Amino acid sequence: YPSKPDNPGEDAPAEDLAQYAADLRHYINLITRQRY
Query: Which experimental method was this entry solved with?
Result: NMR
Angle at CA of residue 7, ends 22 and 19, nearest 5°? 10
CA distance 4 to 21: 29
CA distance 33 to 7: 43
Mind giving me the DSSP string for the chain? --S----S----S-SSHHHHHHHHHHHHHHHHTT--
CA distance 25 to 30: 9
Phi-psi region of 14 (alpha: psi -120 to 50; beta: other; left: phi over 0): left
Closest to 19 measured CA to CA, from 27, 11, 8: 27
